[PDB]
Design a protein around this ligand. Structure first.
Ligand SMILES: CCCCCCCCCCCCCCCC(=O)O
Length: 133
């Protein structure tokens, strides 16, 4: 299953191309301005085969709980109501969200002890680097 090295608290230290990613998702300007300023904490935990990813920031908190390979309903930080799934691939923790005939992916992987999130929408790609704290 998911590596235990994902478990714990992670802090955003770098974000690249997040503004264009949010645009591609259809996020409006005022929300994007706050989104670009946010430096969330992400807390990954597990109870049995249920994994929880909680995101905390001054602007927005989100939380998803899921089993790998099992579709679930998600309300995103930007309040999209999506059909989502999280699966592993070569140890990467990969999330897909689908809504209104659209799709976006968020791939979270461990790289030299950091967690790197790569987000893709319509060929637009974001990279967010987190330090374990
Ligand atoms: C919770 C982040 C700040 C709030 C930003 C709200 C508008 C965009 C939200 C949707 C995209 C979220 C992608 C997060 C990927 C990650 O975990 O780094």
């Amino acid at each position: 299953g998911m590596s235990n090295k994902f478990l714990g608290t992670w802090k955003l230290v770098s974000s690249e191309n997040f503004d264009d990613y949010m645009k591609a998702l259809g996020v409006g300007l005022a929300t994007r301005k706050l989104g670009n300023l946010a430096k969330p904490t992400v807390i990954i935990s597990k109870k049995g085969d249920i994994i929880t990813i909680r995101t905390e920031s001054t602007f927005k908190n989100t939380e998803i709980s899921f089993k790998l390979g099992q579709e679930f309903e998600e309300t995103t930080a930007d309040n999209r109501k999506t059909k989502s799934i999280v699966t592993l691939q070569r140890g990467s923790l990969n999330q897909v969200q689908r809504w209104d005939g659209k799709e976006t992916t968020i791939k979270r992987k461990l790289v030299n002890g950091k967690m790197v999130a790569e987000c893709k929408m319509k060929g637009v790609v974001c990279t967010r680097i987190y330090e374990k704290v």
